[PDB]
């Protein structure tokens, strides 16, 4: 299975999950996958940096 891109992130409650858009599936077929299922470290880093910037934007608002 190859991750094309990550769509979202959640943590319940110790366990982290990622909404994964799979290569060869349409966008609406993305599925939630626990961190250990995934090998795509570059994509994870880019995803996290992107989200970090958005939370920082929000932190500054306050």
For residues 44 and 8, is the Cβ–Cβ distance under 8 A? no
Count of domains forming the chain: 1
Resolution, rounded to a tenth of an Å? 2.2
Give Cα separations from 21 to 25, 49, 51, 55, 60 (angstroms): 7, 18, 17, 22, 31
What technique was this entry resolved by?
A: X-ray
13 prior amide bond cis, ω within 30: yes
Q: Are strands 3-11 and 16-22 parallel, antiparallel or unpaired?
A: antiparallel
Q: Is 41 helix (H, G, I), strand (E, B) or coil?
A: helix
CATH of the domain at 54: 2.40.50.40
Q: Which domain holds residue 20?
A: 1-62
Q: How far apart are CA 10 and CA 51, in angstroms?
A: 12
């Amino acid at each position: 299975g190859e991750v094309e891109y990550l769509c979202d992130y959640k943590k319940i409650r110790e366990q982290e999950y990622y909404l994964v858009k799979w290569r060869g599936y349409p966008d609406s077929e993305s599925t939630w996958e626990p961190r250990q299922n995934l090998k795509c470290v570059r994509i994870l880093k880019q995803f996290h940096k992107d989200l970090e910037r958005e939370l920082l934007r929000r932190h500054h608002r306050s």
